[PDB]
């Protein structure tokens, strides 16, 4: 039921269950040009049931929206969607 990150054709695909449906949904991101803020906006656009979304470091520090997805994906992070927190573990890719 978690959030997964899987590279397909060289790009990260992030799959998540959103609050309003059981059908999981996947988001493909461009690491070098998309930011954290872009991903969060896509989540909100996909599900109007989302009131709150944010990404945190494993230590619980909020990640800036302008941070590139490539930088975020170098390590674990937390994704908060409404009242649920997901621990996300991306595969270690160089930089």
Task: Say how many C-beta atoms besides its own lie within 10 A of residue 18's C-beta.
Answer: 19
Short-list 82, 89, 87, CA closest to 18: 82
d(CA 16, CA 69): 16
- Nearest to Mg ion by Cβ — which residue? 15
> Could you tell me which stretch among 3-11, 17-25, 27-35, 41-49 binds Mg ion (CB under 5 A)?
3-11
Closer residue to Mg ion (CB): 51 or 93 = 93
11 binds Mg ion (CB under 5 A): no
Report the interface residues with Mg ion, using CB under 5 A: 4, 6, 13, 15, 72, 75, 77
């Amino acid at each position: 039921d978690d959030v997964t990150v899987v590279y397909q054709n060289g790009l990260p695909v992030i799959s998540v269950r959103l609050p309003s449906r059981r059908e999981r949904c996947q988001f493909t991101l461009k690491p070098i040009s998309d930011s954290v803020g872009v991903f969060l906006r896509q989540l909100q656009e996909e599900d109007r049931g989302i009131d709150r979304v944010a990404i945190y470091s494993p230590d619980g520090v909020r990640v800036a929206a302008s941070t590139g997805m490539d930088l975020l994906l170098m390590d674990d992070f937390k994704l908060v969607i409404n009242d649920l927190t997901y621990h996300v573990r991306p595969p270690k890719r160089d930089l």
